[PDB]
Design a protein around this nucleic acid. Structure first.
Lengths: 138, 117, 122, 59, 205
RNA sequence: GGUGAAAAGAACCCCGGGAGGGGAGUGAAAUAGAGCCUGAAACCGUGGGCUUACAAGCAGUCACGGCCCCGCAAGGGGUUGU
RNA sequence: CAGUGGAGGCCCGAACCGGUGGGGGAUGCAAACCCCUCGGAUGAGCUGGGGCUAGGAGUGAAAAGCUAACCGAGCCCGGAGA
RNA sequence: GUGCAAGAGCACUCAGGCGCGCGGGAGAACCCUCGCCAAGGAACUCUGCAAGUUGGCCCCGUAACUUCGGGAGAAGGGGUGC
RNA sequence: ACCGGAGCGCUGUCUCGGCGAGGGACCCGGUGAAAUUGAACUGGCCGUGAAGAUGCGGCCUACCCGUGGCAGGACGAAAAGA
RNA sequence: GGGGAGGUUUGGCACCUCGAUGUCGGCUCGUCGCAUCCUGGGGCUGAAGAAGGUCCCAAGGGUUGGGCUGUUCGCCCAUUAAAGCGGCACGCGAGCUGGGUUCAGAACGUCGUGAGACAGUUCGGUCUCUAUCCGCCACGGGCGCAGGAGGCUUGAGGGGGGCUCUUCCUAGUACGAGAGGACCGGAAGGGACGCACCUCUGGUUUCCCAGCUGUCCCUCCAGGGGCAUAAGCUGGGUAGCCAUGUGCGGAAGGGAUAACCGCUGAAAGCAUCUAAGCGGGAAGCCCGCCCCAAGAUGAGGCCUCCCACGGCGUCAAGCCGGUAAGGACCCGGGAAGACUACCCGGUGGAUGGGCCGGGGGUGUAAGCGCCGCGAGGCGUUGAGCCGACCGGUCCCAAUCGUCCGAGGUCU
């Protein structure tokens, strides 16, 4: 009963072991929702993210995405309401994590400051039909 | 709830740093060293850390050692005499122990660093 | 946090484009409004050919703020500003041309009209 | 010599008491094994010593 | 008005139901019942409650290994639930069920001698205009000549910390017997891994 | 301002860096020991007699009680529970 | 008009005079000082040296300010124990 | 000595000098002086007092008015490193 | 560097304060003043009183002494009241 | 037209104070008062309902934020269930401000032959670090409680806490021509406020990591160090500290009541809510609730634990030296703390540190090959480092051991 952390880690029937790995580079696609007097929806949300704050239990992620009005910032609790949430093209090579300088100048400098690592997509290429080779080897 | 954490003080953060480092230099030169108790404590911790780094032998580490210190011949004797002996030792290579009387003039609890081997 | 002595630009046709915060309809000690809130409003910067000239004093309901508020499931949301919607002494969105993403919080309050014409509700 | 100034003398007995909770304080000593004198507790004596007793070079 | 003894752990937010819940857990565990109490030779109705076993030589003497049943002593020793007569055995955690509301008692951590702002709460004032000499200060206390006394209990510059409080109306959502835990709508007073007694709530009876 | 009749104004051992002291020794006297004759009070020490940790005060007065020390008695002084 | 040239009780700002808005200091480092900021800044400038002018008198870009740290008449000393 | 438009400026530092005639631990309230501040932006206040934003050099650009000198660094904006 | 009024940007002036800083404050040792000071054995209420009391009546709270801290009162200290 | 009460206003008096009692408003901090402004209840109404008016009881809690003016007063503003009045030296300058005020400058309007002066105005202008006693708030030392130690309690008394809005439902039924528009119960959110907590949100970290400037030095290169704050500058930032954040507190209910509404019932065959008896009835009173608290001199209670003659008191209470439960000195410390105390561990031990792992912070390092002449850059790489942190680990520090500790009043 000593390690309080032990106990909290035994509360870990609450875990998400099936979510797209991402850095505070980019992310994108979808999330979850409610919407209307019965709930019934999962309002899709893309996004270019900002912050990964690690809490183990609920390492939350704040996300920037600029829509039909202006810039919008939505933070998600990594583990329940969001069903699949799954992104588009992660991106990275970010030096920090906290993309706050983007609430300064969000424009082409955004595009002018982000390159996804190809190596990631190469890993995706391998794991693509190595997953069928996985559905082939023992 | 201040202090509710740790770390002793009374200097400039810089002045602190430079003091710890110096004490390490003067130490590693000799081995058994007279100081005041609080000093002695945070001292033995800091220096111990440095010596466990010395227990390795990477250049990264080496510079890091002398990044916190000064003399080259000191890194020689460090990684040539000191570090080799305390090889099996996985802990406090320094032992600090209190002395009687107290620091004359204003009465302060004294202590002595030791080589411990 | 929206309090008085704050500039709020509207997100519709209106006849205005910037309105300052006067008071709150909330309890006489609630000097604080946010999402789905009722704020009395002076008009400070408007556009000529229109209805609500500069100096007009009508009411308003916020759709968008620079301080995200936690949605009941621990997932917040912010719009980089202090945008509102103009309403009258009868709770009615005076204009007709709502602009940008609102907050569904408004939907639960009683501004069902906005929710509708609202493009991307969040 | 400013605002707060003792208004009427302080009586001798009062001085006494202020100093009643004052007064000097005893020391406390411990026996030295492998030796024969007194030291402060857990300390080292240059006449006695700790285990092994490092130094002890009194003339 | 039942009860249980407990130690504190956790605080999170378990996204149970559909929304989210700040969740503070506590370990009630094998918390002994080692002496009842009865009116004539007491005056109330009560039970002593122990806790965590690790006690060897440093405890000894009366033990109440006497009492009438030994069971040794915990090490966090024992306290008292009022108006409570148990079934007997060292009670555990499952005393309450997921679906109840309760009260919870524990010490407030030490913030010691504090400034009147961070205490009862005052105001101080003038960062600039006025002066610099009375930033975090009480300013006034009492009237001119009559009183000429300083109001007894006038919210003053003093201690604010190592105290104690009982909280009412919480909501224990979970309880695990397998490891002895009790999970409530996070509101726990006091630090993590400390002393805290749980007892049932009050409302209309 | 003033040792003392007179310098006879302190050898020697002792502890101590000395400073200063402890005998020795000086003289009638060192409680004349060196800006020292004679040492009032305020003044801070130290030992012992009485009294004080439910206690409301211009502090003492008056009486009753008890504690200590006196006195041959009877009486007294000192103290303060009330 | 261009080039030239380098005029200013010129312009920004050191040393250099000052002392403006503030904080600090208040038996202070200090019988006027520290920190921030300020204004003069080749001129009515500032500065080392020797000399002059005085108590109803001087000196004053003028406050009755300065004449030795307290000036509606300096200080001393004498009538004066007014 | 080096660097920035330059320099008796500033930042580091030559050489020379020095650590300021009490300190040692804690790591309270509060105070001196100093940094960050959400979201709102003088709502504070007698008063934007104070603090802060602006900040240097090449480029671009400049009202009403005027005694043609000015107002002008008007303001508004662009670069600067390798 | 003179007194208002306004506007932009900006900002802990404010909403409303939270942490952090080192240095003082607090504990160890060395040194160690001041104004003031009739003597104190100094709670409060409610009346009185030369009209605003721990000292007086009635009647009051509370073992004895201290450390840190605030500042209503002792008609608080310094000014033989401008 | 009469009678009063109140002591805020405005005056009359000149007794304390001229060897000083520092006068305005605002900040801060209040507390009391009730002739209640808001919130309950109730009475009556020229009261259908609605809302209104007026009168009695009731201070528990509340009494907002901006504009002008030094200004309180006032008006305005947008609001609110509400924007109450007053006392306490018209509360509060050994607590602040000094803007207003009646210092010396100057001017202004102005009176005076004039120096100067004017409830006439204007611009500037030095609130004095050290709390002796009281009082208040926190904290200890001594003694206490008529055996000695631990541990768990009891509640004397006292303090805190008491608010309050809109909305849906009954039913658009009752009333009402309609417009309007309901009592009674229920249901859901709000605001201000007290409380505690770092999970989420976000500020925070004085050296946790990164980018960087000129520089000076190791060591010419890379690399690395200090300075620039008391971190040079910026970008981020765990723990712990926090509010805007977050879970909660005001309840329900019981008992006596006001004003008032009622029942049986007389004197005084009838009447009465009373003079006997009894019932309903308020955010008000007592409690429930939270917290203190047996210095509740009356020291309480419970549960255990230890025990005489050892030397003077023969008879009388002491006195003296170590012991038994025990407790402390010193140490290693602590979401404890000014000191103390409170809490924990002291070799049989994980208490600090060191070590290794976990998390988390930062974001591909020192260097190695590799492309451009080059600034650099591909790769080795989510690496290296690592402040508090969840813990494992006796590698080193908590060695040795010292001293205080009942001999048990009586009736």
């Amino acid at each position: 009963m000593n390690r309080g952390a032990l106990i909290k880690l035994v509360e870990s029937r609450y875990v998400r072991t099936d979510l797209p790995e991402f850095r505070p580079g980019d992310t994108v696609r979808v999330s979850y929702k409610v919407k209307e007097g019965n709930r019934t929806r999962i309002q899709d949300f893309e996004g270019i993210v900002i912050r990964i704050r690690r809490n183990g239990f609920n390492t939350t992620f704040t996300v920037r995405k600029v829509s039909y009005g202006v810039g919008v910032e939505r933070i998600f609790p990594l583990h329940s309401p969001l069903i699949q949430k799954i992104d588009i093209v992660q991106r990275g090579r970010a030096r920090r994590a906290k993309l706050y300088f983007i609430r300064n100048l969000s424009d082409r400098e955004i595009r002018r400051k982000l390159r996804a690592d190809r190596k990631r997509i190469d890993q995706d290429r391998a794991a693509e039909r190595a997953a069928k080779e996985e559905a082939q080897k023992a | 709830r201040h202090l509710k954490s740790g770390r002793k003080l009374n200097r400039h953060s810089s002045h602190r740093l430079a003091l710890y480092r110096n004490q390490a230099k003067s130490l590693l030169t000799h081995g058994r060293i007279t100081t005041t108790v609080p000093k002695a404590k945070e001292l033995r911790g800091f220096v111990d850390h440095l010596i466990h780094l010395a227990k390795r032998g990477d250049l990264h580490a080496r510079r890091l050692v002398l990044r916190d210190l000064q003399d080259v011949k000191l890194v020689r004797k460090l990684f040539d005499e000191i570090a080799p002996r305390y090889r099996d030792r996985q802990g406090g290579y320094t032992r600090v122990l209190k002395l009687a009387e107290r620091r004359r003039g204003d009465g302060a609890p004294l202590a002595l660093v030791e080589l411990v081997e | 946090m929206i309090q008085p002595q704050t500039y709020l630009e509207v997100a519709d046709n209106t006849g205005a484009r910037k309105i300052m915060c006067i008071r709150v309809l909330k309890g006489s000690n609630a000097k604080y409004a946010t999402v789905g809130d009722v704020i009395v409003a002076s008009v400070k910067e408007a556009i000529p050919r229109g209805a609500v000239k500069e100096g007009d004093v009508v009411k308003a309901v916020v759709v968008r703020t620079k301080k995200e508020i936690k949605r009941p499931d621990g997932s917040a949301i912010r719009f980089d500003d202090n945008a509102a919607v103009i309403i009258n002494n009868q709770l009615e969105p005076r204009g007709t041309r709502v602009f940008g993403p609102v907050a569904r919080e408004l939907r639960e309050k009683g501004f069902m009209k906005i929710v509708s014409l609202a493009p991307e509700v969040l | 010599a400013k605002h707060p100034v003792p208004k009427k003398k302080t009586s001798k007995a009062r001085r006494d008491a202020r100093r009643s909770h004052h007064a000097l304080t005893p020391p406390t000593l411990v026996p030295c094994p492998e030796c024969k004198a007194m030291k402060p507790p857990h300390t080292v004596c240059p006449e006695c010593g700790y285990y092994a007793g490092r130094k002890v070079l009194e003339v | 008005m039942k009860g249980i003894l407990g130690v504190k752990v956790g605080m999170t937010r378990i996204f149970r139901d559909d929304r989210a819940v700040p969740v503070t857990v506590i370990l009630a565990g094998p918390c002994p019942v080692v002496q009842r109490r009865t009116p004539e030779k007491d005056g109330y109705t009560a039970v002593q409650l122990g806790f965590l076993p690790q006690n060897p030589k440093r405890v000894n003497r009366p033990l109440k290994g006497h009492f009438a049943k030994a069971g040794v002593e915990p090490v966090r020793i024992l306290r008292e639930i009022r108006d409570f007569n148990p079934e007997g055995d060292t009670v555990t955690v499952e005393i309450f069920k997921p679906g109840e509301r309760v009260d919870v008692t524990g010490t407030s951590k030490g913030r010691g001698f504090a400034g009147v702002m961070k205490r009862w709460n005052f105001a101080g004032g003038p960062d600039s205009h006025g002066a610099h000499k009375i930033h975090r200060h009480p300013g006034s206390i009492g009237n001119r000549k009559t009183p000429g006394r300083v109001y007894k209990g006038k919210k003053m510059a003093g201690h604010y910390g190592a105290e104690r409080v009982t909280v009412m109306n919480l909501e224990v959502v979970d309880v695990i017997p397998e490891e002895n835990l009790l999970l409530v709508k996070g509101a726990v007073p006091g630090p993590n891994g400390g002393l805290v007694i749980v007892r049932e709530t009050k409302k209309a009876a």
